[PDB]
Design a protein around this motif. Structure first.
Motif, PDB file in Angstrom:
ATOM      1  N   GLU A  29       0.856  -1.205   0.000  1.00 26.93           N
ATOM      2  CA  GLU A  29       0.000   0.000   0.000  1.00 26.93           C
ATOM      3  C   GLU A  29       0.889   1.253   0.000  1.00 26.93           C
ATOM      4  OE1 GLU A  29      -3.514   0.526   2.573  1.00 26.93           O
ATOM      5  OE2 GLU A  29      -3.208   2.676   2.557  1.00 26.93           O
ATOM      6  N   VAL A  36      -4.761  -2.966   0.929  1.00 23.47           N
ATOM      7  CA  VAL A  36      -4.737  -4.417   1.031  1.00 23.47           C
ATOM      8  C   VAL A  36      -5.417  -4.810   2.329  1.00 23.47           C
ATOM      9  CG1 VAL A  36      -3.284  -6.489   1.082  1.00 23.47           C
ATOM     10  CG2 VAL A  36      -2.541  -4.492  -0.252  1.00 23.47           C
ATOM     11  N   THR A  37      -6.409  -5.695   2.256  1.00 20.53           N
ATOM     12  CA  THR A  37      -7.166  -6.125   3.426  1.00 20.53           C
ATOM     13  C   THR A  37      -6.972  -7.628   3.546  1.00 20.53           C
ATOM     14  OG1 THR A  37      -8.734  -4.335   3.277  1.00 20.53           O
ATOM     15  CG2 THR A  37      -9.465  -6.279   4.475  1.00 20.53           C
TER      16      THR A  37
HETATM   17 NA    NA Z   1      -3.809  -3.127   4.622  1.00 17.04          NA
END
Ligand code: NA
Ligand code: NA
Ligand code: NA
Ligand code: NA
Ligand code: NA
Ligand code: NA
Length: 371
Positions: A29, A36-37
């Motif tokens: 990121e 980003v998860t």
């Molecule tokens: Na993240």
């Protein structure tokens, strides 16, 4: 969009290093501005085929490679596009684990297989052959101990010996499996299962030894050796037991053939973020620094990336894991493998008890698997 363009959602199981993975995502990121998860849903391996079938779900899913066969059969996974130079950064056998119907459908991350675990204070020089083990057991029994206890109830644990002298589940050729070429009742499988049953008949092992007994015996210092995987190391009581991990014994001069599981990263076929996912996996995760972040959180075991495996293998347990994996059998990712587990489970139980002769036990299993 259904799956949101311009971000990455990653699913990985709750027993993996998802905090370390999240930190790799944070680095991604910062370089790209793409969020980003990392999520670890319960039952994610059941959820994924449900949500992906409607064009939803995560951009990236992490699971053992054998489950990705079923996903790829349903078109849930994108064909990945690593160039040849990238492919050369990973051990070549790991790419075979992520081929389905000839096409690469995931990135290999880590490698898992059984090893020989031994008590250094009872047995500083563990046997290199199965054939040595009866005589060693007699010596250890005379001094109040036993040579070897491992789970006999499940074929995952007995297959390494059964298959050493030429057994196999399905023949692998050209990115595919021959469902008619099964190595369950051939002379090598018969030799290995005969040796196992003889260990029981000659009172070196008890036919009802299960996972609990072998783990408890080894942790109490009652048995010199067990056969188990990296998931077991943290539980070994190092206060009581100075243990080592090494290459499995050979049989008839041939290596034991443990099944190999390759933790792998697939890209959802419905993802609009396939170039982002490729960049993240190839150039952030599958680097020394990326795998280090995950590994520091929850150990990966041995890894598919050569540069970092060469560092990890300073730990002899990890070196042994990779050695046993390189000599072992990639778990087939085809649906007929479900027939294998139950047919062979039945064969070994029936053989070890005397219900069936070894030859007829394996012949019945061969017939079911090939039906
Ligand atoms: Na993240
Ligand atoms: Na030896
Ligand atoms: Na190297
Ligand atoms: Na380093
Ligand atoms: Na015979
Ligand atoms: Na047969």
């Amino acid at each position: 969009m259904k799956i949101e363009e311009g971000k990455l959602v990653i699913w990985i199981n709750g027993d993996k290093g998802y905090n370390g993975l999240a930190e790799v995502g944070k680095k991604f990121e910062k370089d790209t501005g793409i969020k980003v998860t990392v999520e670890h849903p319960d039952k994610l391996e059941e959820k994924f085929p449900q949500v992906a079938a409607t064009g939803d779900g995560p951009d990236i899913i992490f699971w053992a490679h054998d489950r990705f066969g079923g996903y790829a059969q349903s078109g849930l996974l994108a064909e990945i596009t690593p160039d040849k130079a990238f492919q050369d950064k990973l051990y070549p056998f790991t790419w075979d684990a992520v081929r389905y119907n000839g096409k690469l459908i995931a990135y290999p991350i880590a490698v898992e297989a059984l090893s020989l675990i031994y008590n250094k204070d009872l047995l500083p020089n563990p046997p290199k052959t199965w054939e040595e083990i009866p005589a060693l057991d007699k010596e250890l029994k005379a001094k109040g101990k036993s040579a070897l206890m491992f789970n006999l109830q499940e074929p995952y644990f007995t297959w390494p010996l059964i298959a050493a002298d030429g057994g196999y589940a399905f023949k692998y050729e050209n990115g595919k499996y021959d469902i008619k070429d099964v190595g369950v009742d051939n002379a090598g499988a018969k030799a290995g299962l005969t040796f196992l049953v003889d260990l029981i008949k000659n009172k070196h092992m008890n036919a009802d030894t299960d996972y609990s007994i072998a783990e408890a015996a080894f942790n109490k210092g009652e048995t010199a050796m067990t056969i188990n995987g990296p998931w077991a190391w943290s539980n070994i009581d190092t206060s009581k037991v100075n243990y080592g991990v090494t290459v499995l014994p050979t049989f008839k001069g041939q290596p034991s053939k443990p099944f190999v599981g390759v933790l792998s990263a697939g890209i959802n076929a419905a993802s609009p973020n396939k170039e982002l996912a490729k960049e993240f996996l190839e150039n952030y995760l599958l680097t020394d620094e990326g795998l280090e972040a995950v590994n520091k959180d929850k150990p990966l075991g041995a890894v598919a990336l050569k540069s970092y495996e060469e560092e990890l293998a300073k730990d002899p347990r990890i070196a042994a894991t990779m050695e046993n994996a390189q000599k072992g059998e990639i778990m087939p990712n085809i649906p007929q493998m479900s027939a294998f587990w139950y047919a062979v489970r039945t064969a070994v139980i029936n053989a070890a008890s005397g219900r069936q002769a070894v030859d007829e036990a394996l012949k019945d299993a061969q017939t079911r698997i090939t039906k």
